[PDB]
Amino acid sequence: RSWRHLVCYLCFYGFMAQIRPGESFITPYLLGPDKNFTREQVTNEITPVLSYSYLAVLVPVFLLTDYLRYTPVLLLQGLSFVSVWLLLLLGHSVAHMQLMELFYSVTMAARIAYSSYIFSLVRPARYQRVAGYSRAAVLLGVFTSSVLGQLLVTVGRVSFSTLNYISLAFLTFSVVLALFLKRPKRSLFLARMLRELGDSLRRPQLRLWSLWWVFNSAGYYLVVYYVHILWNEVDPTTNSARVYNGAADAASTLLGAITSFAAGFVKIRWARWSKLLIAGVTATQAGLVFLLAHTRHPSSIWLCYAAFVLFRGSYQFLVPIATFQIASSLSKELCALVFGVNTFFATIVKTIITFIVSDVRGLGLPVRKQFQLYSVYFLILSIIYFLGAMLDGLRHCQ
C-alpha cells in the first residue's frame, strides 16, 4: 500500500528529469544566426573543453557520490543542468561556452549515480522488478524528450531561442521535483579488495571485454560528439525547420532499445565465440563511419541520418553483452569499482586522442579529416580483433 507511493514516485521523477527538449538541438543553436560562432571554433575550442573537463571531473564526482548521500549528488546534477542551460542562453563569446562545456561535463559525470541510488534505496527483496521499471521509465523519458523537442519545431515552427526557454522550464521542474526524494538511509562507501582484484584478473574473457570497452567506447563517443557538427557542415540550415537532428536522436534511441532487447536473448548462446562477433561489429562500424566521412552532397543528408542511426544502434547492441560478460565475475560490491576504473581508462585514452586530433596545439584537423582518421582508427581495431580471432581459430583447428 504505502510502498506504492515511493515505487511510483521514483519512476515519475526519472521520467520527468530525462526531459530536455533542446539537448539534441544544442549544436545547431550555437551556429544559428543569433550567435557569431564559426565551425572551426565550435570544433576546436568549445567541443575539446568538454572532453578535458570530463576527465578532470569524473573521479572526484564518483568518489564524492558515496560520501554524501546519493540525493545531494543527484540534486547537484539537476542544478548543474540548469547552470548549463543558463550559460547557453546567455553565452556571449568562446569563454562563456567553455564554462558551459565544463559545467556540462559535470552533469555528465554524475549521470551514473542514479542507478546506484536506485539500488541502495529500494529494498533488496523487490529489487529486480523495481529496477526494471526504473530502466523502462528512464528509457521512455529519454525517447520522448527528443521526440517532443523535434516535433515542437518541425510542425510547430518555433525559433531556436524559444526552444531554450521552454527547455529551461522543464529543467526547473526537474530540480524542483528532485528535492523531495527521500535520502538513502545508509550507504557509506581491507585485504578483501586486493584478493578479489587478483582473482578477477585471471579470467581472459574479462580481459578481452575490458580492452574492447576501453577502446571502442572511446572511439564511439568521439564520433558522437562531433557528428552534429559534421551534419551542419554537410547542409547549412536553409530553414530552421528542415533540420531533423532530433528525429535522428529519437530513431537512434529506439533502435538502441530494440537491439539491446535482442542482445539479452543470445547473451549465452553466442558466448562460444566472442572475438569473431567483435570483429564483425567493429568492421560494420568502420564501414558506416567511412560512409559518414565521405557523404557530402546536400541531397544525401537523409542518408547521413540513416548512417548515424545505424552506427549508434550497432554500438548499442554490443553494450549489453559486454556488461553481462564483465559483471558475472564478482558481486556488485566490486563491479562498481571495476566499471569505474574501466570507464576512467576509456576517458584517458579519449583525452589523449582528442587533444592530438581535435584541439589546437596539435593537428587540429577540421571535421571531415577528423572523421577520416576515426574511420581508419575503427578499421585498425577491426583488423586487430580479426587477427586475434584468426589466432584463436588456429588454436581450435589443431
From Swiss-Prot:
Residues 66-69, 118-131, 267-272, 324-337 are cytoplasmic. Glycans are attached at residue 36. Keywords: Acetylation, Antiport, Cell membrane, Disease variant, Folate-binding, Glycoprotein, Hereditary hemolytic anemia, Membrane, Phosphoprotein, Transmembrane, Transmembrane helix, Transport. Changing residue 135 to K: Abolishes methotrexate uptake. Changing residue 335 to A: Reduces methotrexate uptake. Reduces IRF3 phosphorylation upon cGAMP stimulation. GO terms for biological process: cyclic-GMP-AMP transmembrane import across plasma membrane; female pregnancy; folate import across plasma membrane; folate transmembrane transport; folic acid metabolic process; folic acid transport; methotrexate transport; organic anion transport. Changing residue 36 to Q: Completely abolishes N-glycosylation without affecting subcellular location or folate:anion antiporter activity. 2',3'-cGAMP binds at residues 111-112, 115, 127, 135, 221, 260, 316, 320, 323, 332, 335, 339. It catalyses: 5-amino-1-(5-phospho-beta-D-ribosyl)imidazole-4-carboxamide(in) + (6S)-5-methyl-5,6,7,8-tetrahydrofolate(out) = 5-amino-1-(5-phospho-beta-D-ribosyl)imidazole-4-carboxamide(out) + (6S)-5-methyl-5,6,7,8-tetrahydrofolate(in); 2',3'-cGAMP(out) + 5-amino-1-(5-phospho-beta-D-ribosyl)imidazole-4-carboxamide(in) = 2',3'-cGAMP(in) + 5-amino-1-(5-phospho-beta-D-ribosyl)imidazole-4-carboxamide(out); 3',3'-cGAMP(out) + 5-amino-1-(5-phospho-beta-D-ribosyl)imidazole-4-carboxamide(in) = 3',3'-cGAMP(in) + 5-amino-1-(5-phospho-beta-D-ribosyl)imidazole-4-carboxamide(out). Its main location: membrane. It is a multi-pass membrane protein. Changing residue 228 to A: Reduces methotrexate uptake. Has separate binding pockets for folates and cyclic dinucleotides. Two cyclic dinucleotides can be accommodated in the binding pocket and they are likely transported at the same time. It is linked to Megaloblastic anemia, folate-responsive: An autosomal recessive metabolic disorder characterized by megaloblastic anemia resulting from decreased folate transport into erythrocytes. Disease manifestations include hemolytic anemia, hyperhomocysteinemia, and low vitamin B12. Serum folate levels are normal, but erythrocyte folate levels are decreased. Treatment with oral folate corrects the anemia and normalizes homocysteine. Immunodeficiency 114, folate-responsive: An autosomal recessive immunologic disorder manifesting in early infancy and characterized by recurrent skin and respiratory infections, mucosal bleeding, oral ulcers, chronic diarrhea, and poor overall growth. Affected individuals have lymphopenia, low serum immunoglobulins, and impaired T cell proliferation. Some patients have global developmental delay. This is Reduced folate transporter. It comes from Homo sapiens.
